Design a protein around this ligand. Structure first.
Ligand code: HEM
Ligand code: HEM
Lengths: 178, 55, 378, 100, 73
């Protein structure tokens, strides 16, 4: 489910083709006001734990804007997850998963880390099934549990002079419906 | 014990607005009864309900 | 992106309340700005409902205020909120100024000037408010201070003829003082915004004296709930005062109708003008007393122009800190002396404390500054 | 001299021995102090901002480092005073040439 | 007094900020708080207290002298 959500939000770099026409609303706004150099919004997990993560690089005179629109997209998925964005995220999950599982090293990497952790390898029919299982209702369930008013871990590095205090992340982390 | 209270009342904002209104009316009724009772208890005797009963 | 950063009002709100980079060091002695603001608009509110139920005429003034005491629902608590809120207001204003003189924020110049103007305006405003409710003490103290305005050479007596409407305190004079008490707190609020405007220009001050540009924090929501905490402590002091001893700061001698033939012996203004009455009655002169009063507030103007230290606060200057607490005790001393009637030992220590006050300021402060300057191997 | 012991008791009774600030840290800023702070090497400058930041945090929490970490009077390694006096002299010389 | 971003320059400083939900609401609220506030109490009476006793004695001395100047009839 978080793979679907972070397929919707995902990543941007300053060296792409076509900025004002990106489907990702965070990407369109960050091109519009010229906020980020790059970001990645993703998952990394260890055994029943891990970091549901996001990482943006930008200039210090634009930090709180990027943080604002990032939390805005997170809470938009928390409350008003409609269908077309879920459809687009499931297409992107298909594409990233299939084109990832390619070659020799990604294949054998998948199988090795699968059978150290699971006890088994996931077949692609399981991936197509667990793509077909998850819709916007599952999205708003998972986003209401995992994001909505949970305590963050913020790693700040560099020119952090504008980067707000932790309590601003807490108070703007949920919505009071604004 | 308290997780029930957080899940029912302290997730959404409309749930929180309704629970502070509900607590407002509950606290209203309860605190007015308590204020009346305790205040007549420290002023037993020389209050005009008592002498009104004795009139 | 956000309405807070681009909306033309909300940019002013953003630079006012949300994102003021404050120092992360101030204790509760910096609450009093917002406390004086909430006191000020609470004063405006109480006085507004008062003036809804008040008729300004010497036939009907004390009867009208009596009507507020009787028939207006919770009118007695609205009248007492206005009176004791004024008293709380002047307590907190002295707290604000005592901060600004202790912790070295008086290096800020133009903000200090606009503050001094606010001091004059609040004095005159609450003074004419005290003239309004038509008491014995009101009539006679305002008569005295009308003659105090007559004290100045060559301009003053015709000026008092001009403010009289006649020869004495008359109905026209009561309505004059009503309109000026009725209109001056809005000028107070505008110059309060100007005060805050210069301070947002420069930047705030810490308890220590070192400018804290490395360690700023957002103003919201730390100081919002800190000043709400300060407000709750303030309001319970105000309400315990109005609900348990209203006649504490209230006066026995106030409540008779204004008899122009009595002149009671134990005469006094309110507690906040006791030094304004003692330093008045200290030097045996009309002109000398009124000039001593205006020169005392002009000494309060001078207080930045003689900062010759090289630290900022009095916190790291211990001798001057003891001198400052001597000044605290001396102001409270002359307050108690101004409350006390004119008798021989009180004459003695009133004269002594007034000249001690001016000697502490004009001579002792830069000398203590140069000793503290010399002693740290400078 | 007896006044040296007065200075000893004074630097005791001041308080910034207890905070952990040297003498070139508690200086009220005019523009001369601004120029003097910029005319510093990088190591002194970062030590200055770090000692000020510890002073602000310890004054916020109102808890004081013990006797074991205080600046003793015989380790007053003041650094900014000659830079500051040279900027004083050059400001004075500019003052004087604007006089006459 | 401006925005965050051009206030001043500080390098090489790492700050570890703890979430408020990790710590108790009042840790050592008495057990350190009361001895350290008595410590700061010790640190202030020999600066601020001598004007207190000066006003105290001048007040009661003036009241006694006042009633004595009354009673010399
Ligand atoms: C009319 C009553 C006054 C109001 C409502 C008022 C309000 C404020 C406010 C809101 C602040 C900013 C926050 C604070 O520092 O408390 C402030 C700061 C200041 N005020 Fe006033 N003030 C008043 C009177 C005065 C007076 C009479 C003075 C003395 C001349 C004064 C001197 C200062 C100074 C020096 C500061 C800067 C202190 C700092 O922020 O570090 N104020 N005032
Ligand atoms: C523009 C807003 C204000 C209005 C409309 C207003 C109105 C009034 C009125 C009608 C009275 C006479 C009623 C009475 O006290 O028995 C009065 C008295 C008074 N006002 Fe105000 N006032 C205002 C602002 C203030 C402020 C800002 C202060 C000072 C903090 C103040 C202090 C006083 C005082 C001390 C009295 C005399 C109270 C007494 O002894 O009975 N007023 N005001």
């Amino acid at each position: 489910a978080l793979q679907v959500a972070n397929a919707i939000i995902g990543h941007y770099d300053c060296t792409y083709g076509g900025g004002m026409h990106l489907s990702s609303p965070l990407a369109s706004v960050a091109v519009t006001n010229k906020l980020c150099q790059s970001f990645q919004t993703f998952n990394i997990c260890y055994a029943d734990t891990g970091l549901l993560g996001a990482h943006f690089v930008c200039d210090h005179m634009s930090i709180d804007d990027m943080m604002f629109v990032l939390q805005g997209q997170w809470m938009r998925l928390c409350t008003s997850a409609t269908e077309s964005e879920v459809v687009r995220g499931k297409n992107l999950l298909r594409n990233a998963l299939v084109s990832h599982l390619d070659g020799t090293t990604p294949v054998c990497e998948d199988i090795g880390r699968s059978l150290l952790t699971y006890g088994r390898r996931i077949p692609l029919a399981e991936w197509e099934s667990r793509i077909a299982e998850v819709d916007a209702r599952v999205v708003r369930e998972v986003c209401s549990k995992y994001f909505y008013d949970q305590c963050p871990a913020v790693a700040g590095f560099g020119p952090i002079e504008q980067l707000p205090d932790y309590n601003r992340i807490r108070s703007g982390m949920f919505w009071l419906r604004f | 014990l308290t997780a029930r209270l957080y899940s029912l009342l302290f997730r959404r904002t409309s749930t929180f607005a309704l629970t502070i209104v509900v607590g407002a009316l509950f606290f209203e009724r309860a605190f007015d009864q308590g204020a009346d009772a305790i205040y007549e208890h420290i002023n037993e005797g020389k209050l005009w309900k008592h002498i009104k009963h004795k009139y | 992106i956000n309405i807070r950063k681009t909306h033309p009002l909300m940019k002013i709100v953003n630079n006012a309340f949300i994102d003021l980079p404050a120092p992360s060091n101030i204790s509760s002695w910096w609450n009093f700005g917002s406390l004086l603001g909430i006191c000020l608009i609470l004063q405006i509110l109480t006085g507004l409902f008062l003036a809804m139920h008040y008729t300004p005429d010497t036939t009907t003034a004390f009867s009208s205020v009596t009507h507020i005491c009787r028939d207006v629902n919770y009118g007695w608590i609205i009248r007492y909120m206005h009176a004791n809120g004024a008293s709380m207001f002047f307590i907190c204003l002295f707290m604000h100024v005592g901060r600004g003189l202790y912790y070295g924020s008086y290096t800020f110049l133009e903000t200090w000037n606009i503050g001094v103007i606010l001091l004059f305006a609040t004095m005159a405003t609450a003074f004419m408010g005290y003239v309004l409710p038509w008491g014995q003490m009101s009539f006679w103290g305002a008569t005295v201070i009308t003659n105090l305005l007559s004290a100045i050479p060559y301009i003053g007596t015709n000026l008092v003829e001009w403010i009289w409407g006649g020869f004495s305190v008359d109905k026209a004079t009561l309505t004059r003082f009503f309109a000026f008490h009725f209109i001056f707190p809005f000028i107070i609020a505008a110059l309060a915004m100007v005060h805050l405007l210069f301070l947002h220009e420069t930047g705030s001050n810490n308890p220590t004296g070192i400018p804290s540009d490395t360690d700023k924090i957002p103003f919201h929501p730390y100081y919002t709930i800190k000043d709400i905490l300060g407000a709750i402590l303030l309001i319970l002091i105000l309400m315990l005062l109005v609900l348990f001893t209203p006649d504490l700061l209230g006066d026995p001698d106030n409540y008779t109708p204004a008899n122009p033939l009595n002149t009671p012996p134990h005469i006094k203004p309110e507690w906040y003008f006791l030094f304004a009455y003692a330093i008045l009655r200290s030097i045996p002169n009309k002109l000398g007393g009124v000039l001593a009063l205006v020169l005392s507030i002009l000494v309060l103007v001078i207080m930045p122009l003689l900062h010759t230290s090289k630290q900022r606060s009095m916190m790291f200057r211990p001798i001057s800190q003891c001198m400052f607490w001597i000044l605290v005790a001396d102001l409270l001393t002359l307050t108690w002396i101004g409350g006390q009637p004119v008798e021989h030992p009180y004459i003695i220590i009133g004269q002594l404390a007034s000249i001690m006050y001016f000697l502490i300021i004009l001579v002792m402060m830069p000398v203590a500054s140069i000793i503290e300057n010399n002693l740290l191997k400078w | 001299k007896w006044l040296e012991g007065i200075r000893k008791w004074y630097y005791n009774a001041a308080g910034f021995n207890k905070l952990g600030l040297m003498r070139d840290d508690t200086i009220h800023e005019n523009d001369d102090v601004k120029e003097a702070i910029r005319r510093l090497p990088e190591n002194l400058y970062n030590d200055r901002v770090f000692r000020i930041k510890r002073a602000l945090d310890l004054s916020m929490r109102q808890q004081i480092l013990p006797k074991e970490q205080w600046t003793k009077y015989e380790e007053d390694k003041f650094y900014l005073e000659p830079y500051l006096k040279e900027v004083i002299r050059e400001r004075k010389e500019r003052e004087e040439w604007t006089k006459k | 007094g401006r925005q965050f971003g051009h206030l001043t320059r500080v390098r090489h400083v790492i700050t570890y900020s703890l979430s408020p939900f990790e710590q108790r609401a009042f840790p050592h609220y008495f057990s350190k708080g009361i001895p350290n506030v008595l410590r700061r109490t010790r640190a202030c009476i020999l600066r601020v207290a001598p004007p207190f006793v000066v006003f105290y004695l001048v007040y009661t001395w003036g009241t006694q002298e006042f009633e004595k100047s009354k009673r010399k009839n």
